[PDB]
Structure formats: structure tokens, C-alpha cells
Design a protein around this ligand. Sequence first.
Ligand SMILES: NC(=O)C1=CN([C@@H]2O[C@H](COP(=O)(O)OP(=O)(O)OC[C@H]3O[C@@H](n4cnc5c(N)ncnc54)[C@H](OP(=O)(O)O)[C@@H]3O)[C@@H](O)[C@H]2O)C=CC1
Ligand SMILES: NC(=O)C1=CN([C@@H]2O[C@H](COP(=O)(O)OP(=O)(O)OC[C@H]3O[C@@H](n4cnc5c(N)ncnc54)[C@H](OP(=O)(O)O)[C@@H]3O)[C@@H](O)[C@H]2O)C=CC1
Lengths: 241, 236, 241, 250
Amino acid sequence: LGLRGKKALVTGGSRGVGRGVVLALARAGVDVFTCYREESDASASLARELKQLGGDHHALRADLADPKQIAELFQEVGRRFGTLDVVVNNAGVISHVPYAELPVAEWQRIVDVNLTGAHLVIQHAIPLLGDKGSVISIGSKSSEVGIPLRAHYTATKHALRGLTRSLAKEYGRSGLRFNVLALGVVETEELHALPTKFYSTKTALGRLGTPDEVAGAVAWLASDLSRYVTGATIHVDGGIS
Amino acid sequence: ELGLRGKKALVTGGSRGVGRGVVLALARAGVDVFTCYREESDASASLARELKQLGGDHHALRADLADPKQIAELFQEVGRRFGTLDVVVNNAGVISHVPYAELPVAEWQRIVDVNLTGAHLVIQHAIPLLGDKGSVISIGSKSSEVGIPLRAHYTATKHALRGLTRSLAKEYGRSGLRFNVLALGVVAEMTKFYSTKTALGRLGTPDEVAGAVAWLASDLSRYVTGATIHVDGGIS
Amino acid sequence: ELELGLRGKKALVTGGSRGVGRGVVLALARAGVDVFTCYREESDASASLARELKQLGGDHHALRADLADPKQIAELFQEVGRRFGTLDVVVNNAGVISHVPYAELPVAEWQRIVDVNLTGAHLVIQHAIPLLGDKGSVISIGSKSSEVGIPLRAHYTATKHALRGLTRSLAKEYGRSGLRFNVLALGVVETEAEMTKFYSTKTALGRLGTPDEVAGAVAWLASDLSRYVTGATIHVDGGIS
Amino acid sequence: LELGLRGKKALVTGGSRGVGRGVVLALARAGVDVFTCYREESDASASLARELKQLGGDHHALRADLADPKQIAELFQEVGRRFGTLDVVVNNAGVISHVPYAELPVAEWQRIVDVNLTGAHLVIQHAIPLLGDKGSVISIGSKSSEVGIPLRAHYTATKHALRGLTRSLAKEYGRSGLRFNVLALGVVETEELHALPDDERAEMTKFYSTKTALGRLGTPDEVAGAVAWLASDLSRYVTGATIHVDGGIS
Ligand SMILES: NC(=O)C1=CN([C@@H]2O[C@H](COP(=O)(O)OP(=O)(O)OC[C@H]3O[C@@H](n4cnc5c(N)ncnc54)[C@H](OP(=O)(O)O)[C@@H]3O)[C@@H](O)[C@H]2O)C=CC1
Ligand SMILES: NC(=O)C1=CN([C@@H]2O[C@H](COP(=O)(O)OP(=O)(O)OC[C@H]3O[C@@H](n4cnc5c(N)ncnc54)[C@H](OP(=O)(O)O)[C@@H]3O)[C@@H](O)[C@H]2O)C=CC1
């Protein structure tokens, strides 16, 4: 595996899947740079824990819907890190709106964060990945299945597959690998609600996913054990539907 | 058979290429065809004439699909001239060959605004006009599965059309609306580079696209929704 | 020019006495296609089929032939050669299924599902290729379920998925010879209360399929309107899960 | 984040040559007790047994023609008798041939079906009682089964069948602690290296590297990297999936 000493950027790592991937990479000895949109309890506790671990980690506010802020985020990634080994496009948004009522600004918001943001993050990171780098984008199985009231979400998550596939062709001989992780249903802040079975019935394993299991796949794509894996969609979904 | 005669269709980007073939083939079959283009050209003037000469209630207006209010205007005129729609064909799209590291954000936005947001807005405006029964066809690409250097922004948008279509299929299926994607292949030291990749050894023609479009517009495909139909000659 | 142009063609449809095959056979026949069909055992289904084909005047033939036996596939095609001489359309529709727990699946039941669904489909195609000549459309009946997975039926989905891998190489091999090969991925189709609503909830259209809806797709693939379609998996499944 | 592979017990079919030999040796060097099989006594099988002996611990290599259900029963008598338990199964044994489809004799179709599809099915069916409440079943597939290749339709039919088998088995046994996945391989250099050279000096290598994104063929050890992950608890939520280890070939 050999992750110790690498430098990784993980967008949207203050909550859920991003927070699990960030903390798991850090405990493995990866220098993890992460970002978030707004100062909240989650990012404050995230910085607190990142400091409690031994490593060169950073957590900065950056709204990926604003290309200016992506440029500033990568200014200080190159300032503090200088290089990157792993980029993990994980930041994303979602909303449940009937399609006929979906406002143009909410369509544009989901496109700007989930798709244009991941693209700009990748584009800025290409110079800093160098001779060798692994780019991982978080997709979802739902874009193959289709879910009502979230056509704008599945549109963006499926676009990441088309983006990754062409990028893998373009930069393969440069030593850069691009892949997508197709996620099932991962338990995140369902703990904030009160009474899961609806989705567990759809899985083959009979349980929802955990952010650390996504981290297990991210760690493999970060590792040289996957050095011949590029342009692929890796399903980490428990065989759902 | 297909039973297309009399139905009403909107085909975006019908002045040239694949769109012009679909528009002209649907018109000759007795379909009232409403099409649009981005800029007044010899192709759009030639198109407007050939349409005006057929026994048909055909229309061709200018509408830049990267401008949401030109799309809203386009559908005000479709609603006045047609009142209703049976089939919509998201064909308008753009492509450019740019080294990814050199791709400016504006050219990225242009491909997204036309290929992705445009198709979404056209669909969103057309749903009221389709009523209780309709068939929405979006033009995709086999290249979004293969990957093509210098065109990651293009394959991003064309693959987005599949994720959109799959969710719209499930949202509007019980309302009588069907949503599908046509994955197209390549439509002489260039013809044969692509012919060698095909199973049939030849490039496609717009009228063969019209053959699939016609099937998806008919009740013969009434149980087909949320699908990606490959019209690519088995390429790659 | 936007017409199917099926009148006068010659078609072979395997397993045409019940279910999807019977619907495809009768729909092609009513459209003026001379239909050759087969079945495994003399029943009233086959007797009803022959009586109705006689009532729809045309050069139709319905013979007994067990596709699990390569000797009877060979003779079926001697009869096809005698009576038709040529073929325009082939529909690999015949297939068997059983619900057996995978650990208790006997070798003979596995082998019979393989013999009929896969080896039989392959022998039908191998025998039919000479009869198709310069131009022909081969259609194999697949299933959407082989992408989803169904417990107690891993042998069924194994064979129905194998038809896709066979079809795709066959399209590459014979494309320049004027032969097209495709698969119809079927959803749940009404044939021979709780199950109807159980599967209808999984569709996008909220209803199960009809054999005539399959025939609508077969009709397209048999037509010149699909002359550039080959090596494809066409889904006729109502958007099922 | 660790592969906890030391001490596990694996069965890798067809381990004397090529990809399976790379997977056997890589797993054995990692502290996995590896059971493997082969069809005929060759110098490849003897070389494998000797190199396994230079390692530890107890690896086993036994002849078993998987076109014969009786010899698969023999193989699993010896596995349950020397191991008693399995943690990983890799369906790697496979055959291929170039026959013009119109010339393809029925016995050659049946041979490819017997080894690539029925053989793997019997191996999985015999291995389930030994995998218990936790196990990982990996089947070696091919990217070529979705691109299509002339003169090999019988091969791509069987390699694509493995995906349909795997997906339904994942649904059926997922709640029992068993996971099932496919590794779709690209062009992996094996002893391609003997049908040298000009035929091989860049005719084969260059034609296939042009199709890849990385511009190079795969090695058995890179396949072993994927087999390692799927055998590990880092992939405990990965089941019913087709993992592409193909260098982006298309
Ligand atoms: N939850 C699930 O079931 C699964 C998730 N996914 C995908 O995994 C990824 C993680 O999502 P998930 O964990 O579920 O939800 P999150 O709770 O993680 O919410 C979004 C995360 O990304 C950040 N974020 C949102 N918008 C921005 C923005 N403009 N700029 C920077 N950061 C932003 C958020 O930071 P902040 O706190 O400041 O808002 C937050 O950390 C998503 O892409 C999702 O599509 C798909 C299938 C399984
Ligand atoms: N480029 C590639 O290598 C590709 C690999 N694959 C798949 O990887 C797997 C192995 O590929 P490869 O490394 O080339 O294997 P090889 O063709 O080089 O050798 C096959 C192995 O399987 C053994 N084996 C055990 N039982 C049998 C049996 N009944 N019949 C035949 N062989 C048996 C063989 O033993 P023996 O020494 O007696 O022959 C041999 O060790 C195959 O399933 C293949 O489909 C998929 C895509 C591409």
C-alpha cells in the first residue's frame, strides 16, 4: 500500500464521506489538505482533530462554486505542500426538488459545485501532481439507477464518469491515473434524524455503507497496488439494486 | 407501422449535420417539425426554404440555447404555433479540441451551457407541452464511454445526459413521458481511421439516426424508457 | 423511407409457442413476415399456434425441436433450408429458468440451462449464418436481470449475460459481411396480484411489459431503420430498477 | 489501513503460468497459504511447486482438469483435507482459441464453456461450504467481453457470463458474509514473451499499448494488486462489482 509520506487533497472533508476519508488517510501517515464551504462546528472539530494527529495537515475554507476561491485554495496548497500525490473530488451538494419546479439557480448551483468545481479542482491540481498522481472522483450508483426529484444530482454525478474517462486517456502516458468511486448509500448524518431498512433491502450485504469503507477503496486507488487501474468506475456500494 | 404522420416534434440544432437529417426525415414522414438554430447562415436559410416547400406546418427560429431566456422565448413561440408536442429531440451541441490544461473556464462553461444546461432547459420547458404522452430523445455519444483526449469537457456533458435521462424516466414514467438517449458513433485518411474501429466498416449517416429517432417517437417503443440506444455501427 | 419494410421477409423465432416468442411470432406474421418457429414438446400451445398461423394466411412453419440437442437443431435447419431457403431475421427467444438455491443446484440443471440458453442460442446462430447470406439481422433475447442479479437464479443470469458477450464479438466479426447482431434486454413481461405490484413498483412506467411491446423492438431491429445498429444491448424494460 | 492478508488461505485455479502464477506467488510472499491447481504436469507446474517450497508456509499445487467435474471434486477433497477452510477464491483458469466462427466445432465451443464457465461455477459451488461466514470470491474477467473480438466469440461469451454469475451470487450470499466480484483484465503480458520476437517486437506490444491509456501492457503482479485489495477488509463493502484492471484500454 505504502501511503505514508504522500500528500493528498480532499475536497469537502468536514462531514460524512469526506471527513472519513480525510481522517483515515491522516492516521495512515498521509499529509492531508482538505477544505469546506463554511465555518461550522464540523470544520472546527475537524481542525481540532487534524492537529491532534502527527502530520502536515491543513483545513481551509473554500467555496467551490466560486472559481476565484478554488484558485486561492490551490495557491496555498502549492505554498504549504508544493506537490500532491492524491486528489479526491468528494465535495458535492444535493437537493430533492420536483423537476418542473427546479429553479435555474438551483440547477446551476448543483452543476457549479458537483461538476464545474470538481473539474476546476482537477485542472488546478494537474501541475502539482507531477510525474505521478492519482485522481479519485466520488460518483454514485444512483446515476445508473435514476432517482426522482434528483435528476440534476444524477446528471452531475454521471458527468464525472465521462470527464474521468477522457482525462485518463489524455494523461495516462504522463503517469496520472483518473478513476471514479461509485458509492451506494453511506450512513453519515442519519444520526441527526429519528427512525435505513428501505435501502438495506436494496443492498446485497444488508447494511448501509460506512465512510471508512469508502476510505478503504480510496486508499487502494491512492496506492501503487492499483497502478494499472485508470479510467475505471469502482463500485463501493454493497451490491445495491 | 411507426404511425408518425400528424405528430409534432421539436428538434434543436436542425440547421446542419445530424439535426438537419432528423428534421428533414421527420418532415417527409408527415411530422410537424419545429426546429431551431443559433446563427443565421446559409444552412439555416436553405433549411427554412426546404421546410417551407414540404406539405407541412414546419418552423425554424433562431435560439441560442446558452441563453435561458432565448429558450423561454423559443417555447412561447412553440406554444403559440404548435400548442402541444409529442416528441422532443435534444440534438444541439458543440465540441472543441483543447488540451485539458489549456482549457479556459469560458470554453468549459460554453460546452456546459449548450450541451448540458440547454438540454435540461429545453426538456423543462417542453414537459408542459408534452401533456399526458410524450417521448424525449437526447443525443448522446459512444465517446463518453471510451474517453477522448482534448475533449473531456465534451464527454462530460454527453455522459451527463444519461444521468439526467435515467432520473427523468423514473420521475415521469407514470405520467406517460418517456426519456431515452441515442448514443451515436461517428457520423479519407480520416474516414478509414474511424471505419476501422466500427463493426460495419463505414461511418453513419444522419438518416440512420433518423431511423432510431423515428422508432423512439413511435408507440412501437412504448415500453422503452431510461435506456441508452446505441446507433454507432458497433464502434470501438 | 421511414417505414419498417417487413413485408415479404423470412424470420426464424425459437420458442414461439408461449410467452414472448408467441407474441413476436404472431406480430411478425400479421405484418406479412413468413415466420419459422420451433417448440420443445407437442402441447395445445403449439397446436393453437399452428391453427392460428394457418388462419393468418402465409408461409409459416412450426416444428418440434429440443435446442438442448445439437442433432435436432441441425435437422430444424434442414427443414428451414427446404421450406424457406433463406433468412432475413433470427430471434433467439427460447430459454429456460428455475429457482434453485445455488448450493443445491445439481450439475444437470446447471448444464441444461447452459445447453438451452447459451449453447443452443449459439448453434442456432451458427446454423443460421449461411442462410442469411449478404444481409441479416440476428436478435437474442437477454434480460435486464443479469445486470441487477437475482438470488436462486445465478445460472439463468449467467447464460443471459453470456448472450451479450457472444453478440458483441459476432457483430465485430460479421459486420462487414452485412450481418447485424443485437440483444434485447427485457424487463418483467406478462406471460402464462402480489408479484405484479412488486415488480411494477420497480419500473418507471408502473406496469409490466407485453409480448407485443417486445415485438415492437424486434420489428425495429429487423427493419432497415436500424441498419447502423449492431453489437448493441437494447433495453425493453420500462426502466426497471 | 492495512491489508490483513497474513495467515489467510486462498484457492487460485490455474496457477502454473501467466496471471495465476503471478497471483499465487504474490499472495504466498505476503503470508497467504495458497492452494492452486493446473491441468497438466509441465515444467511450469514443477517450477511453481519448487518456488512455493522455498517459501512458507503450506502451499499446495495439485493437478485438476476443471473440464471434469470429478477432478474438481477431487481437488476440493484435498483442500478441505489439508486446509479445512477457505478465505479467498480466485477463478483464474481459462482457455482461448482463434477459430472463424463459422468453422467453430461444437467440441471446441463445449471445451471453452466447460473450463471458463462451468468449471468456475463448480469451483465456487464446492468452495462455498469451506468459506463459511466470511469469504471473498474473485473471478477473472476480460475487458474484451464488452468490446467484442472476432474469432473469439466463444471466449467472450464465457468471460461475460462470469459477470452475470457473480452479480446474482453477490445478491444471494451477501447477507451470509460472502462477497463476489469480477476483475476485468486488459492485455496482460504473459509468456507472450516466447512467441518472440518481431511478431512480438512491437506488432503485439505496440498494437495493444496504443489502445491503452498508460501506453503499456499489464503484468501479473498488477493483477495481484487488485486481487490483494478484494481479498482484504479494505474492500469489505465491495461486492457484485466488475473492477477494471486494464490500463484504460479501449
Ligand atoms: N451520503 C451518501 O449516501 C453517499 C454520498 N455520495 C456522494 O459522496 C460525496 C460526499 O457527500 P456526503 O458525505 O453524503 O454529504 P456531506 O455531508 O459530506 O455534504 C457535503 C460535503 O462537502 C462540503 N461542501 C458542500 N458544498 C461545498 C462547496 N461549494 N465547497 C466546498 N465544500 C462543500 C461540505 O462542507 P460544509 O460543511 O462547509 O458544507 C461537506 O463537507 C458526495 O459527492 C455524494 O454525491 C453518493 C452516494 C453515497
Ligand atoms: N492478456 C491476458 O492475459 C488476459 C487474461 N484474462 C483471463 O486470465 C486468466 C488467465 O490468463 P493467462 O495468464 O493468460 O493464463 P494461461 O493461458 O497463460 O494459462 C492458463 C492457466 O490455467 C491452468 N489450468 C488449470 N486447469 C485448467 C484447465 N482445465 N484448462 C486450462 N487451463 C487450466 C493452466 O494449467 P496448464 O499449465 O496445464 O495449462 C494454466 O496454468 C484467463 O481466465 C483469462 O481469460 C482475461 C483478459 C486478458
